[PDB]
């Protein structure tokens, strides 16, 4: 019958896996053709980030399942440019098949790609003309956030948006440990709004209802609760005695304890809250669960849903006195901003488009990696393919003073990196061969390594004046976690598929 095995297995997986890369190699670059996302249920959206593309796609071959598994293990590392790992995966796999045509064993191709990567990262450190003083760099951080927004008209509000980004990385700037944690989630995206109404609020505005629907909302006092207290005619008369009891024992236990804006998560009757309103104190019914940390950090406290543990130093906490109409046509939401600073900080987005919500959360997280890589390791590389051409030239140069057959891996390596400026030039609607080799000749005649591919269609190929800037951690992680998986695919030969009844 049939049984696919041997080196023909390695031929079949590569043309499988690079086919996935052939899906993603048109999404590289900010001028890359961004791409829909249609569920089996029937939902429809658009996305440009390749990580969402590979994650929410459902593949059939196990090599592609491995690919999306490992590239989701790159999203925590970088999250930006995870497309290029798949593109380099397809490129190195194609060149490895080209070496397999001449009979080289794929183990030798794999560790030759490893030696070429050990040329690559170190030469990337050699061409690292980074500016390391990028700490109080509020003026070049406009250009840092500029290329992240460059595919849209968000640059026209980057005087708002990029300054939101620089204030965001200012507020999260733990100057010694240098990380966004699980508490510092920087998103409040109001679906509906405009370009500038994505603006500066370091506070909590969630869609929960009021204490009273005509209550004076001015609760300046930090004396604010959060309750773990649920609802858990002699039946209703005993329950009403429990209700006025719950008043004169829960609220009087509060008067012993200090948990005043009783935002209950469960059932309640608001006439007790109305009698609190006649005594001039608020209490909200049926509020949401996991927002206790986000509310409570607004002066510096943490999660306090308890009856008794919410004391005068661990109250429900509030940010900054401002009173704007949250729901204009919507119900006006909670003013949880009165008092002090929020470390686990969260910004006001009023983006009406799901694209501008998706980019302003995840490109802000990518800032939170690369402006983390302006504090954690302040090493930037001028991108736009210039890093790849500068790296590939030295990989080909180190493929000269080495005596082994492994040499043919490194020449197969460098050309594979040439798919990165090619797909930048192909998606930007130019000649992919001639532009990249002209930039390569301009680099071999002029030793500036910041000559790349004009993706923005600006003046020249010099990435200094246009500031197409990646970080060296984002480049090194990309190349190393492309090599560490090209070796993984090349080390795997026989997919004896279970349940696929081998006759």
């Amino acid at each position: 019958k049939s049984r696919l095995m041997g080196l023909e297995a390695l031929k079949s997986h590569i043309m499988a896996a690079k086919a996935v890369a052939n899906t993603m190699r048109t999404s590289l670059g900010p001028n890359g053709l961004d791409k829909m996302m249609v569920d089996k249920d029937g939902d429809v959206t658009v996305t440009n980030d390749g990580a969402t593309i590979l994650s929410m796609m459902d593949v059939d071959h196990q090599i592609a399942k491995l690919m999306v598994e490992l590239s989701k293990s790159q999203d925590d590392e970088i999250g930006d440019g995870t497309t290029g790992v798949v593109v380099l995966a397809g490129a190195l796999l194609e060149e490895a098949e080209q070496l397999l045509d001449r009979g080289i064993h794929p183990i030798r191709i794999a560790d030759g790609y490893e030696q070429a990567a050990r040329v690559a990262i170190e030469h990337l450190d050699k061409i690292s003309d980074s500016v390391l003083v990028d700490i109080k760099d509020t003026e070049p951080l406009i250009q840092t956030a500029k290329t992240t927004l460059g595919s849209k008209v968000v640059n026209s509000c980057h005087r708002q948006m990029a300054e939101i980004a620089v204030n965001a990385v200012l507020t999260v700037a733990d100057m010694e440990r240098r990380d966004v944690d699980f508490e510092l989630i920087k998103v409040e995206g109001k679906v509906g709004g405009r370009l500038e109404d994505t603006k500066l609020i370091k506070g909590v505005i969630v869609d929960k209802d009021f204490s009273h629907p005509q209550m004076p909302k001015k609760v300046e006092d930090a004396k604010i609760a959060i309750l773990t207290c649920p609802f858990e005619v002699e039946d209703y008369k005993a329950l009403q005695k429990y209700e006025k009891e719950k008043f004169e024992e829960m609220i009087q236990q509060i008067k012993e304890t200090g948990a005043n804006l009783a935002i209950c998560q469960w059932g309640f009757d608001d006439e007790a809250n109305h009698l609190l309103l006649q005594n001039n104190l608020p209490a909200v019914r049926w509020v949401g669960g996991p927002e206790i940390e986000l509310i409570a950090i607004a002066t510096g406290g943490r999660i306090v849903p308890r009856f008794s543990e919410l004391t005068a130093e661990k109250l429900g906490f509030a940010g900054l006195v401002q009173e704007i109409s949250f729901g204009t046509t919507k119900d006006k939401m909670l003013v949880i901003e009165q008092c002090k600073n929020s470390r686990a900080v969260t910004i006001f987005i009023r983006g009406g488009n799901k694209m501008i919500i998706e980019e302003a959360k995840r490109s802000l997280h990518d800032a939170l990696c690369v402006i983390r890589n302006l504090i954690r390791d302040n090493r930037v590389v001028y991108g736009g393919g210039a890093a790849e051409i500068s790296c590939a030239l030295a990989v080909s140069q180190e493929a000269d003073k080495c005596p082994t057959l492994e040499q043919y891996a490194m020449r197969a390596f460098a050309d594979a990196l040439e798919v990165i400026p090619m797909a930048l030039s192909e998606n930007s609607g130019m000649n992919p061969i001639q532009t990249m080799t002209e930039v390569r000749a301009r680099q071999v005649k002029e030793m500036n390594p910041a000559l790349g591919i004009d993706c923005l269609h600006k003046g020249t190929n010099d990435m200094k004046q246009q500031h197409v800037i990646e970080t060296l951690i984002g480049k090194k992680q990309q190349i190393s976690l492309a090599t560490q998986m090209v070796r993984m695919i090349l080390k795997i030969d026989d997919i004896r598929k279970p349940g696929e009844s081998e006759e």
Partner: protein
Amino acid sequence: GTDSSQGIPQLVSNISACQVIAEAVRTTLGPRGMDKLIVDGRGKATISNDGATILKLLDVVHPAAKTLVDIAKSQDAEVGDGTTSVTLLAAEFLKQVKPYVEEGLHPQIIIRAFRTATQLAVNKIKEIAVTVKKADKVEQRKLLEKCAMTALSSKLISQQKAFFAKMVVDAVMMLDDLLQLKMIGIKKVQGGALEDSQLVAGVAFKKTFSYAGFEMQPKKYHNPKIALLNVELELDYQAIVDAEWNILYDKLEKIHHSGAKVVLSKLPIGDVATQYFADRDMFCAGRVPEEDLKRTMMACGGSIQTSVNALSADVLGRCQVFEETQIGGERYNFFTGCPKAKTCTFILRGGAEQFMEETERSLHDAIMIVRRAIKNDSVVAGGGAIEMELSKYLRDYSRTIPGKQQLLIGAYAKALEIIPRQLCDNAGFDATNILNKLRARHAQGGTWYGVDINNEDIADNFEAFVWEPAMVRINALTAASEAACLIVSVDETIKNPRS
């Protein structure tokens, strides 16, 4: 369409069945063997380079394949690694004895020839066995560190593998009670350089939401021990709330009364209720792995509990010290300091994530190599030098014996030669030159010229301290011969179905 159930078709079907299951584990031989990927069928991707880890998770439908995979199962119960070598050797025995069967030679004759050749080989391995014990291996232990160096020699890891070699000889020497893979775990730590790794004297576990409660626990404590509980800790309509409040009260009071420092369970503890179960007044832990369950009871000694106010004698009994430290930034569990310390866990502090695979391929046999070089001293070389010496001896024994066994013992000889031939093919070199240049100076110069895995040229593995245990090779080729003669002795497979 091919029907094969008569006697010569029976044996031909049996040896094709062993050849296919040998090809199913052919590439995995050696330290740098090719990985094989299988699934469960539902999406549980398993990439393996081990043999029995492949073979158990593999399917097996054939009778003769099933009656060799039992020998394969028997070989992993000794040390683990080596199950591919015995199966590949027995399959090459069958493939080399193949053309003699259909030409008209009897299976009992070739079985007896296999047995006599095996007795000759197990004789000749004993005389060339060399002990290396009192050449400074436990006192002035550095030469036993030198074979600890044989895991990752002359690499960029080798500078850190100096520390890894010192710590693997410590991970063997401090705990030698016929040590196992269970008593020494490795723990991956992201971030940092590979030189910053460690070997702790105790357990080490990352804490998650369902794992463990709250920091600032009694670390520097004289006798910190464990409650090992199997009940949860977490939180008519007027008669169901007060009972839960009272249960919250008595489970709070259990921590004061029993005096447990850290309660352990296979049940979730709330880290969204972090201070709320710091309002248990002490540390706790939940959702426990079995290695934590052993290595804090068989080594530390934390007692097991049953009820509402379950007190015991070993919830604050004799262990040395507690620790909870940002190892690589993330705070980990440490019930370290075990009074019955067959527990020293490796702490892989390093940057890249897939170096866990590198260490669990390269230091998971280095523990085996070092603890075997302590366990066995009568050792021989590796790299297929030993099979080559036995092949030379039996190539002589074939032509120096009259009778029909002469063609069979030589068939016993050349069938050894795929052991390095599969090795270099897993390395990448040409098998033909690396075998001919091996055999020339092997038949002229000396014995222990072997196949080097790094530069792919014939070297002296006895001088590179590549020690293979003599008893392990004895059991290996004994099992290879036994699984050979079992399939050769099999002719008929009677089915007798249901219907």
